[PDB]
Design a protein around this ligand. Sequence first.
Ligand code: NA
Ligand SMILES: [Zn+2]
Lengths: 381, 27
Amino acid sequence: MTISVKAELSHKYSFTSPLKGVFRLIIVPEKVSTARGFHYIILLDTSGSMYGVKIETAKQGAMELLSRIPEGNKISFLTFSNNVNILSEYADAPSLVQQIKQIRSGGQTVLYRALERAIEIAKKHDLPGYIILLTDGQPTDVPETDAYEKLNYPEAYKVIAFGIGDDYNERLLKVITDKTAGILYHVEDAKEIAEMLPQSAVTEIGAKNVSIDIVSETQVKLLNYPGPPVKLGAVESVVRVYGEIIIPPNFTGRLATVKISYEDPLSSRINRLEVNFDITRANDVKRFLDGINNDLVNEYRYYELMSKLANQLNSNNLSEATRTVEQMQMIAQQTRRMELIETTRRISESIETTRRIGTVEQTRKISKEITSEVTKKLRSH
Amino acid sequence: PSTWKCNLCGYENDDDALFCIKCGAQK
Ligand code: NA
Ligand SMILES: [Zn+2]
């Protein structure tokens, strides 16, 4: 029913140089209530390559997903592949079961036109929501990733993409999710679809229609969310928003103010939260460096490097990928956090083995795996 | 040698980074 905010800046004092301050906003949902008033838009690829276990498992998972969504929500279902086909628009689930059962495989993949249609449908109404997308191959209408960069996605609509198999374009889906504060799930086995797709249903939330505005006297740059302002349809689990802000030399005063607004999903009340980053000028270097939260600097750098890692594997720069994961290891071990240390081992782990195999087959695989993991680490649990 | 040192802190900062990672000072 509510949201709590802890906001931390890396620097307490400024000094003689332009400084790259980094900040973290931790948003915690409290006493979570049933999620209602959301518009789920499902985009299912039914191309020829989908024939078999992939599409039957997707159909069953879709029905289970519809079962899991609470009742006060609207559902749209699209099937795209040779042409876009709307099964239902802004409706309820009972309509779809019979139609889901008649889905057939066949045709190319027209992801661009399906996304355009999903955007139009989302923009037909004033509800936040989600775009649940499953595909197993590249788009055949628009394979250029830059085109998916330029789309005007609906605000407060998070894209949950399920990339199936070894033939889709992980970089394109990453662009989609990055532009929509979304999540990319790599699915290597169709089995995974049956347990994973229903989890994209949001049952209980701490806030609805969240708006994070950042009023700064200097340039502000978010790491893992579009904005500022950040427009999140809902808060289901802890949100960590990372960003950078240029602290000018010898600055003193109110550097930035973060205003968070949201709707109580139960009381339907507008709550507004306000945090101030007040900085002073340091008159000594030891006095300036003691004002640095080095753990936050290391955490921000860690996630920066992880984003770079996804990009580098997408670019086949395995050498830089190795150097990057190594730095992530050093950061994890410097923070003495078991969770980060293992996560980084598991990744270095894979990168070294791919360098062993030294084939596009394997590089392209771990690219998918790690590209998904980046989005998951940066925008959930 | 092809790295750069930060003056405010004492970190050896790669020419890859324009800002110091330990302290945030500009190149
Ligand atoms: Na496909
Ligand atoms: Zn420094």
